[PDB]
Design a protein around this ligand. Structure first.
Ligand SMILES: O=C(O)[C@@H]1C[C@H]2CC[C@@H]1CN(c1ncnc3nc[nH]c13)C2
Length: 167
């Protein structure tokens, strides 16, 4: 039993809710919140900008030190950093950005990072400003992630479409 509430069960291990991931993280304090990161960990907008804003920019300060030490992430890769006031840990995962011409096949590699964590609160990777089809992203998630994932979808219209079209 865990503290996630109000989710629709899609599969054995994938759950979904119309929710603001920032507000959901603030209430649940999950072990792991996933950020929709880019390779530079520049958290300017979308989910990343919202999460970072909720940390009062502490996420960005920590991220800048990480990059200065380690260099950029790979598209499809991840790193574990602090969850600040939102979660124990933040798993920064880089899905391909279609608006940058990155290969969508890398979306499966991106979701594989979730399998290193037993339970996660997450957005749909490569959705929103990353330009991928969220229906496709959900399919890859379900077919790739084997650990327990609680997906937060900000847009109510999109949430209803994801549920209604789910096979
Ligand atoms: O989930 C959505 O509605 C869409 C799919 C992804 C890209 C575009 C939007 C928003 N984006 C998000 N942006 C900011 N906070 C969020 N909390 C959950 N998801 C959030 C996620």
């Amino acid at each position: 039993v865990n503290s996630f509430s109000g989710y629709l069960k899609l599969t054995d291990n994938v759950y979904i809710k119309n929710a603001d991931i920032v507000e959901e993280a603030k209430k649940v304090k999950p072990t792991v919140v996933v950020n929709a990161a880019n390779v530079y960990l520049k958290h300017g907008g979308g989910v990343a900008g919202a999460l970072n804003k909720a940390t009062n920019n502490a996420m960005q300060v920590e991220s800048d030190d990480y990059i200065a030490t380690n260099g950029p992430l790979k598209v499809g890769g991840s790193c574990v950093l602090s969850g600040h006031n939102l979660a124990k840990h933040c798993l920064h995962v880089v899905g391909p950005n279609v608006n940058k011409g990155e290969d969508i096949q890398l979306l499966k590699s991106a979701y594989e990072n979730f399998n290193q964590h037993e339970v996660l609160l997450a957005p749909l990777l490569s959705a929103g400003i990353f330009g991928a089809d969220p229906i496709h992203s959900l399919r890859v998630c379900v077919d790739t992630v084997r650990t327990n994932v609680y997906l937060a979808v900000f847009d109510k219209n999109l949430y209803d479409k994801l549920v209604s079209s789910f096979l």
